[PDB]
Write a protein that binds this ligand. Structure first.
Ligand SMILES: O=c1[nH]c2cc(C(F)(F)F)c(N3CCOCC3)cc2n(CP(=O)(O)O)c1=O
Ligand SMILES: O=c1[nH]c2cc(C(F)(F)F)c(N3CCOCC3)cc2n(CP(=O)(O)O)c1=O
Lengths: 130, 173, 61, 32, 169, 51
């Protein structure tokens, strides 16, 4: 609009090509007008902040991708609360966790005894389904 | 990220380097012009013609390294914001209630808490009782769970005062 | 027991749950707004400068 | 600190530009 | 010549019709507490079939200003009224084109109306925070057709200006 | 812009070189600002047991 309203940006392809050069960091045909230069300065710092944010957000998600490994011990079970855990509803395993003396396993038995809903299953295949 | 006030210093240094570029380029008797020098300084600040005066080019190069350091630190600090996302609390101590006035706070309408805050001698708690006694609207709640629901429906705009054991119990439910 | 172990909150233990939100548009909305403001300001400046140039050309002839 | 090194380089290049323009003006006034 | 003017006229007519369809219904879609469609005025659920005005703006001050702008979709309504005014100006300049400068002002108002409609689309996308309605894509297509129609209009204007400059010499 | 073979290959050697250098500078500064926003100091005895 403005370049044909006051050249080398007279065509639609030259205007779109300078718009692409403004959208990326690098660039081609340098305008000489006041209004065209201020349109470039508005759009160009705009997309510079956008691609800087894209770089930072991709760096953040790749930082997330290299974070803490999954659960490897009962201390890792005590350290989290998102992924649930349970035993069979009847057997010597429940007697072992019930009569335990370690406070970590005591907190495990307290959480599995006060969970909503029940984490206990009837059979082994029911636990496989769960 | 990186600043709340330093951007104005960046813009003022941009104007100053533009004035220096116009002083070098337009005092030698092609790259002259105050707006041409300003737009070349704009092209120096972001990424994407060059003067041949061999003295203001040093100014352009140091400004160009300067804004490269700027955008490197900008990318770094914005990644630092987007990495951890550590939400912080605006209110920490009891003096934070007297320090501001946007977020309100209240007690129960009747009880020994009101007798404590009413018969106080500390000027901080006296100002607290003055603010809670002339509050608009009525900040006092009917019951305890009504005050809990009033805080839960406040979206960070209203607080309730009570004993520590009950508050630590409600925090753990 | 009756506050932390009986309670249903596992607070101060978990920490970060990776924050799996990509990016909201709230970080982009004011940037769009200042883009539109700059475009409209450039439109009005270009129109008044063209009107002033046309008036000067009509007065000079 | 980056402001400080920018102002230092700016003032250094400004004084260098001033002395080279003064020497060029003196040489042009002496020769021509 | 006249074929490009007729193409610009039917492009402005199609852009006005798609803007009317975007104002009408099915602008957005969202799952309530089953999905539900919305057309920036009222929402209709998938009981199933009931419709009500769910565009309630209440339940910093810049958030209140953004909620006031997003209330009742003020910017796309003003953009559609400006597109109607630009279309009326283009229809008045098509027949008996006496002044050779009303087309440029009509095209400038048309491009500014497209920019305001894009700003209103950014506002309507900003207040959304799952699918989207087809009238949003229809409004985007009308924005693309309006951009192409503005390009064709200023191309015809610079062609007429070059013809007037060639005939004046 | 130069037009020679050898000058262009000198530029291509030096230029990707310093591009990788400033990319590493950006990444390392981002890493140290990530370190700067890490875990707060000790606030309880559980934090004493954690370290
Ligand atoms: O004496 C016992 N010997 C057991 C031997 C086994 C096996 F591993 F198959 F040999 C198992 N299972 C492990 C889990 O899946 C089902 C079968 C249970 C046993 N139980 C029941 P507990 O009381 O729960 O230990 C006993 O009582
Ligand atoms: O003797 C008293 N003992 C009190 C003991 C308690 C509790 F903590 F539950 F043990 C409470 N609550 C505090 C908040 O949760 C609801 C009830 C109020 C008490 N009050 C009323 P006050 O006069 O307002 O302190 C007394 O009078």
């Amino acid at each position: 609009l403005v370049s044909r309203f006051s050249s080398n940006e007279f065509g639609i392809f030259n205007s779109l090509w300078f718009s692409l050069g403004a959208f990326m960091q690098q660039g081609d045909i340098s305008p000489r007008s006041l209004s065209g230069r201020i349109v470039g300065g508005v759009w160009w710092f705009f997309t510079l902040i956008i691609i800087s944010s894209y770089t930072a957000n991709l760096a953040a998600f790749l930082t997330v991708e290299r974070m803490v490994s999954p659960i490897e011990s009962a201390e890792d079970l005590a350290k989290q609360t998102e992924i649930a855990y349970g035993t069979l509803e009847a057997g010597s395993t429940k007697e072992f966790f019930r009569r335990s003396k370690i406070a970590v396993f005591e907190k495990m038995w307290t959480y599995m005894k006060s969970a909503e809903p029940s984490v206990f299953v009837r059979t082994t295949e029911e636990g496989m389904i769960r | 990220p990186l600043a709340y006030e330093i951007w104005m210093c960046i813009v003022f240094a941009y104007i100053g380097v533009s004035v220096v570029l116009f002083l070098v380029s337009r005092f030698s008797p092609n790259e002259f012009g105050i707006f041409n020098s300003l737009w070349f300084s704009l092209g120096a600040f972001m990424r994407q013609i060059s003067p041949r005066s061999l003295s203001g080019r040093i100014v352009g190069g140091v400004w160009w390294f300067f804004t490269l350091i700027i955008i490197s630190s900008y990318t770094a600090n914005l990644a630092a914001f987007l990495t951890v996302e550590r939400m912080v609390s605006p209110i920490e101590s009891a003096e934070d209630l007297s320090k501001q006035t946007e977020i309100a706070y209240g007690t129960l309408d009747s009880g020994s808490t009101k007798e404590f805050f009413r018969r106080s001698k500390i000027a901080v708690f006296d100002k607290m009782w003055t603010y809670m006694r002339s509050a608009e609207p009525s900040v006092f709640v009917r019951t305890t769970a009504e005050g809990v629901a009033r805080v839960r429906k406040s979206k960070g705009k209203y607080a309730y005062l009570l004993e520590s054991t009950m508050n630590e119990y409600i925090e753990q439910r | 027991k009756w506050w932390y172990d009986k309670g249903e909150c596992g607070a101060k233990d978990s920490g970060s749950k990776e924050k799996t939100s990509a990016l909201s548009l709230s970080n982009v909305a004011g940037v769009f707004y200042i883009l539109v403001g700059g475009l409209g300001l450039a439109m009005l400046v270009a129109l008044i400068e063209f009107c002033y140039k046309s008036r000067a050309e009509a007065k000079r002839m | 600190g980056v402001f400080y090194i920018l102002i230092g380089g700016l003032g250094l290049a400004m004084l260098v530009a001033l002395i080279e323009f003064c020497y060029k003006s003196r040489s042009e006034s002496k020769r021509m | 010549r006249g074929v490009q003017m007729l193409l610009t006229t039917v492009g402005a007519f199609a852009a006005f019709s798609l803007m009317t369809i975007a104002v009408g219904t099915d602008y957005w879609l969202y799952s309530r507490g089953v999905m539900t469609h919305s057309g920036l005025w009222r929402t209709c659920c998938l009981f199933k079939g009931l419709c009500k005005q769910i565009d309630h703006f209440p339940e910093d001050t810049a958030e209140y200003f953004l909620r006031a702008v997003r209330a009742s979709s003020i910017f796309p309504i003003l953009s559609v009224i400006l597109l109607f005014m630009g279309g009326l100006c283009i229809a008045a300049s098509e027949f008996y084109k006496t002044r050779h400068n009303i087309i440029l002002s009509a095209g400038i108002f048309f491009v500014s109306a497209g920019l305001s409609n894009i700003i209103g689309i950014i506002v309507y996308i900003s207040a959304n925070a799952y699918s989207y309605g087809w009238s949003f894509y229809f409004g985007a297509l009308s924005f693309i057709i309006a951009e192409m129609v503005g390009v064709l209009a200023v191309h015809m204007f610079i062609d007429r200006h070059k013809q007037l400059r060639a005939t004046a010499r």
